[PDB]
Curated annotation (Swiss-Prot), chain A:
GO terms for biological process: proteasome-mediated ubiquitin-dependent protein catabolic process. Keywords: Isopeptide bond, Phosphoprotein, Proteasome, Ubl conjugation. There is a cross-link at K204 (Glycyl lysine isopeptide (Lys-Gly) (interchain with G-Cter in SUMO2)). It comes from the Eukaryota. Component of the 19S proteasome regulatory particle complex. The 26S proteasome consists of a 20S core particle (CP) and two 19S regulatory subunits (RP). The regulatory particle is made of a lid composed of 9 subunits including PSMD8, a base containing 6 ATPases and few additional components. Interacts with DDI2. Interacts with TASOR. Residues 69-238 form the PCI domain. It comes from Homo sapiens. GO terms for cellular component: cytosol; nucleoplasm; nucleus; proteasome accessory complex; proteasome complex; proteasome regulatory particle; proteasome regulatory particle, lid subcomplex. The chain holds residues 94 to 350 of 350 of the full protein. This is 26S proteasome non-ATPase regulatory subunit 8.
Curated annotation (Swiss-Prot), chain B:
The chain holds residues 24 to 59 of 406 of the full protein. Belongs to the AAA ATPase family. It comes from the Eukaryota. Component of the 26S proteasome, a multiprotein complex involved in the ATP-dependent degradation of ubiquitinated proteins. This complex plays a key role in the maintenance of protein homeostasis by removing misfolded or damaged proteins, which could impair cellular functions, and by removing proteins whose functions are no longer required. Therefore, the proteasome participates in numerous cellular processes, including cell cycle progression, apoptosis, or DNA damage repair. It is found in: Cytoplasm; Nucleus. This is 26S proteasome regulatory subunit 8. Component of the 19S proteasome regulatory particle complex. The 26S proteasome consists of a 20S core particle (CP) and two 19S regulatory subunits (RP). The regulatory particle is made of a lid composed of 9 subunits, a base containing 6 ATPases including PSMC5 and few additional components. Component of a complex with USP49 and RUVBL1. Interacts with PRPF19. Interacts with TRIM5. Interacts with NDC80. Interacts with PAAF1. Interacts, in vitro, with the thyroid hormone receptor (in a thyroid hormone T3-dependent manner) and with retinoid X receptor (RXR). Interacts with ERCC6. Disulfide bonds: none annotated.
Curated annotation (Swiss-Prot), chain D:
One of its GO terms (molecular function) is enzyme regulator activity. The keyword ATP-binding does not apply. This is 26S proteasome non-ATPase regulatory subunit 3. Keywords: Isopeptide bond, Phosphoprotein, Proteasome, Ubl conjugation. Residues 1-44 are annotated as: Disordered. Pfam families: PCI, Rpn3_C. The keyword Ubl conjugation applies.
From Swiss-Prot, chain E:
Belongs to the proteasome subunit S1 family. The lineage of its organism: Eukaryota, Metazoa, Chordata, Craniata, Vertebrata. The chain holds residues 7 to 158 of 953 of the full protein. Component of the 26S proteasome, a multiprotein complex involved in the ATP-dependent degradation of ubiquitinated proteins. This complex plays a key role in the maintenance of protein homeostasis by removing misfolded or damaged proteins, which could impair cellular functions, and by removing proteins whose functions are no longer required. Therefore, the proteasome participates in numerous cellular processes, including cell cycle progression, apoptosis, or DNA damage repair. This is 26S proteasome non-ATPase regulatory subunit 1. Component of the 19S proteasome regulatory particle complex. The 26S proteasome consists of a 20S core particle (CP) and two 19S regulatory subunits (RP). The regulatory particle is made of a lid composed of 9 subunits, a base containing 6 ATPases and few additional components including PSMD1. Interacts with ADRM1. Interacts with ZFAND1.
Amino acid sequence: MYEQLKGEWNRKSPNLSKCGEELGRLKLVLLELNFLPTTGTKLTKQQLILARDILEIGAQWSILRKDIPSFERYMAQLKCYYFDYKEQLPESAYMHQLLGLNLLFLLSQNRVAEFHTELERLPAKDIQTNVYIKHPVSLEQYLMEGSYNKVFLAKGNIPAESYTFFIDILLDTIRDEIAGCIEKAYEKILFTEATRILFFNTPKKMTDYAKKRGWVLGPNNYYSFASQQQKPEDTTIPSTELAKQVIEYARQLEMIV
Amino acid sequence: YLSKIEELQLIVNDKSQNLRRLQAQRNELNAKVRLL
Amino acid sequence: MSEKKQPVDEDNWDDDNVEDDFSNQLRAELEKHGYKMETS
Amino acid sequence: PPPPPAPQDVEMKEEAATGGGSTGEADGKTAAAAAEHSQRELDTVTLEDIKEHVKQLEKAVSGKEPRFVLRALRMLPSTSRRLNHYVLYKAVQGFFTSNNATRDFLLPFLEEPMDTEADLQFRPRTGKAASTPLLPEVEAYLQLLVVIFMMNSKRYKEAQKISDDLMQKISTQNRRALDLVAAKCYYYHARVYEFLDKLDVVRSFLHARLRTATLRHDADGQATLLNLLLRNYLHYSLYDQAEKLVSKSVFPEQANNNEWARYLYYTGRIKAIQLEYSEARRTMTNALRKAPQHTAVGFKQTVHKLLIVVELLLGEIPDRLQFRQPSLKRSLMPYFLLTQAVRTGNLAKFNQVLDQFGEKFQADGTYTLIIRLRHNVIKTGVRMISLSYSRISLADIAQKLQLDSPEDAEFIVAKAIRDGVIEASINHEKGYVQSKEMIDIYSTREPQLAFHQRISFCLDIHNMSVKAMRFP
Amino acid sequence: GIISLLDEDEPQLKEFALHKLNAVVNDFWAEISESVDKIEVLYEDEGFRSRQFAALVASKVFYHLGAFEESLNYALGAGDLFNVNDNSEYVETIIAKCIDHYTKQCVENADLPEGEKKPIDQRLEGIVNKMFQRCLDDHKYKQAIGIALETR
């Protein structure tokens, strides 16, 4: 039934808009089928097993075309594919690394609690197995342990079907967190600590840092500023604002007994 | 039935009569403390 | 008051609170703490 | 046959108050809540939860539920003669032969107080007639000929949702009896529904039941059904805590004074599992000091083991032994050595407590503790030693805690500045920290900053005691 | 995540999103609260010819979140299938607040001599003259003169 849904099955990219022909075909799948109100009778969900398959391959298209709204789109589709109440499905092929795509994208965009709802939705397959998840979670333990060099130790082997863009964004979250954490409260660094904490010895990008953050490139030398803190005294008057506080404070002690 | 909940729900606000029952009793109490 | 999820759920022991403020610290050892005198 | 007179007495003492007295407390009463027999009946429901309820065995089978559910009638003032019927039927258990007429014959017994006559108009008698028989049936979940009948009895309680939603047709505030009973019985709904499987369309039951209690009768229903919804989203996968993040409408009068306590506990577990130290530990602390009593044996204990997991994750906790029930000791055989592993800085013991007690750690099921507990060990080290010495070296602390290199000690000190505990900087040639402590920080105008909150909090509680002095 | 599936800028995938809405909106009450902005995008777009349904699920999600004056705005924006409903929670509480706005509006405009009023928005008066005929043809005119009280 309905043969030509499989028209982009095994060659993955001749174009962008022939995947748009497949998008029109999945548009007709949304016209005719609509996966979410479909309750049971699990032979009207076997073409939806096929839809799970080719929309995992569409998530591979979303990382192939770099489209992040399409990435979160098809990833929310996969999230809904584990969410509809007929959970008794055939075991998903790209299950191990769709969680990893989502998790490494999350790790790139610096989230704070969706990491832990990821640690709660499927916890039991994290420590025993699933290197696409077992390697990012202990990798996060190593990232907030204190090593941006475990990045490269790991990058020894993490393509993991096009996590390459996400580990490039991970290099970006190395470098802009260096832009923060290069002198948070340091004395001074030199060329060699730039060479250690930063990488790629001198592009116009650390020169762009020195000419982009309001920075003094000292004589083979670095400083955040001439005082690093913009001289805190905060006003030199802590009195009259708390005098206004005394006004409304005595006022609230008034009208009450 | 549109406005026909609201007056009876403002009658639900009539603990003002009981908190002011304590207040009017205290009015009587300390006013006749004074008069005593 | 059991109305929640829960219907499925100083002899040597308050000295153990200061002793677990002490358990990682110098059990008795008495020689070490008497022989730190004579190594100089 | 001499003990069943004690259920014979307490049964009549219950529905005397409930039926006659709270029906007279429903007729014209409830200025705020003059249905004091409602709280009396919830006290007796706690009394039937202490004791056996009425007729689980009681040396016989099935005496009271076929008996008293007949003939209420609410009529001409000789309905105390129907009460005399209720009283003088009690020669059957002592004298005559008892027979089985519960859990099977109850299906027309519930329709008897409707098919006698047009009894009365109010729903708390109907909630009585479908609660006071059927709550004595729920706590025997032996899953054989008893749990399908809890299931159908709470389908009659779903008909009580229907006759809570479409009875008195607007604004007669019998929800300050039926939501007070319905808190209990909807918890027992969730219990019996999830003794077998997760509940799926009962989620939408609960959603629309929260919806119907929005403004017209917003009294003890919203917070309790929200506890139901919260523990629903707690027991299963964790997707709709963003619903509380977008629809935070969680603030009633906080009426039952323990519902709010355990509510703050459950949402403390939420913020513990979202991500939090500070706000989560302070609402855990407020629920801890808002433990109502210890009049219920060892029920604070397991829930406290899971309560102070975040305080363990602080690293600034000693041994917790003042809480320890001696019957909890054989279950905290992992947990005692776990807080010992918090006090110790050993790494092989940090993973050997895991290698020794991973099954009880799964009984916790909250490996968010172990995903940051190593980081907690190194933060305990940095807090102690950075509070200890003014100008320490990173090598001293590093190869005192086995770091083996300067640059990961640099990343530790750097992420500790980023986490902001101490000033400590690096005398940058090859590391070798140059640093300081912080005394002479400030001590005079800074207390009186917080003293505004001190005494403004005090005057808030002044006015609250004023508005509480208003009550007699 | 049901709103990121809307990059197709026609209404013809907004309709599939609404076919997801009227299926699982009570489960996804958490989801639409962020999507308030794109529901606004749907209401502002006159080329979106289903803007009636945009204002429908707008007043639905605002009835969920507890917005009531914007529930009134998009309740008027909901259209002609709005007043006709006989449902017992949603439509009658929001037409309660709507004709409450009608009577307080007729009080304020009865406090406003000779015009300069706020005009009748184009989805008032529906159950006024339709439930008014229920009150009339139910042959007890006490509501039929109660509106005459309420309008001054």
